[PDB]
Amino acid sequence: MKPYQRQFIEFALNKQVLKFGEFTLKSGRKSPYFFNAGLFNTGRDLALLGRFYAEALVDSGIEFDLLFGPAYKGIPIATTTAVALAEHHDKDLPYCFNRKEAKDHGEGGSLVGSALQGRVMLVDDVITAGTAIRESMEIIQAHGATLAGVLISLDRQERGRGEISAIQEVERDYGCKVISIITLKDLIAYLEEKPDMAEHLAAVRAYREEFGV
């Protein structure tokens, strides 16, 4: 597992974005850990998150022409990732986001920033159901842009209602790739190193057993 990976977990933990306990997922599953990015709500968190996002992008080697932050949660994300790319990776890219706004019987469309033009890299925190981007791929697909990939923080890698993960469905219905900073797998790997976290280890190990993909 990579260096920026390990630091990621550490920061997540630290800001208590990662928690070990007993949490009920949206799906209704009882889960032994949770990840709430909602809790990265500070200047420096923001600074730190963008730097991790950029790394991951960069380490992917995927080609893309622009960042696109969705709904609401993706804007500070796209925004921070975009500054991160240019201050540290010397990559200067265009950004863009949509107005959720739909004030008149129909949907939205409306965008802020650069033009939905080219290979678009989607950017979000987490994908639980994989439905929110399905909204957001439609916009891309309308403007005639193409999808490069999606980048999130965590791939939980557990089945959905079927036998594949929500992520595999998105990758599968969208013919794109989903990149992430960390997976379940790294989580474990990490917990393996921390002798006095064996109780969490065990529980996360067991969950991956009953539900992991």
Ligand X SMILES: O=C(O)c1cc(=O)[nH]c(=O)[nH]1
Binding residues: 26, 34-35, 72-73, 99-100, 103, 105, 124-132, 156
Q: Which residue has the tokens 């595999």?
A: 168
Q: Decide if 103 is catalytic.
A: yes
Give the x-and-dash track for 132-171 against ligand X (CB under 6 A).
----------------------------------------
Per-residue exposure over 15-38, b if at least 16 CB sit within 10 Å of its own CB, e if not: bebbbbeeeeeeeeeebbbebebe
Is 126 among the residues that bind ligand X (CB under 6 A)?
A: yes
Is 50 among the residues that bind its own copies (CB under 8 A)?
A: yes
Residues 68-107 touching its own copies, rule: CB under 8 A, are 72-73, 75-76, 79-80, 82-83, 85-87, 91-97, 99-101
Could you tell me how far CA 92 lies from the centroid of its own chain?
Answer: 21
Token readout for 138 is 């439609």
Of the candidates 51, 41, 104, the residue with the CA atom closest to the CA atom of residue 73: 41
Of the candidates 14, 198, 23, the residue with the CA atom closest to the CA atom of residue 128: 23
Catalytic residue among 19, 103, 185, 194: 103
Is 129 among the residues that bind ligand PRP (CB under 6 A)?
A: yes
Residue 170 and residue 63: Cα distance in Å, rounded? 19
Residues making up the binding site for orotate: 34-35, 128, 156
Residue 50 binding target from its own copies, Mg ion, ligand PRP, none, CB below 5 to 8 Å by type: its own copies
Token readout for 64 is 């893309």
Q: How many residues contact ligand PRP, by CB under 6 A?
A: 13
Please, are residues 135 and 100 in contact by the beta-carbon 8 Å criterion? Answer: no
Paired with 30 in beta bridges are: 24
Catalytic residue among 2, 19, 88, 105: 105
Q: Give the footprint of ligand PRP on this chain (CB under 6 A).
A: 71-73, 112, 124-132
Q: Give the footprint of ligand X on this chain (CB under 6 A).
A: 25-27, 34-36, 126, 128
- Which residues are part of the catalytic machinery? 103, 105
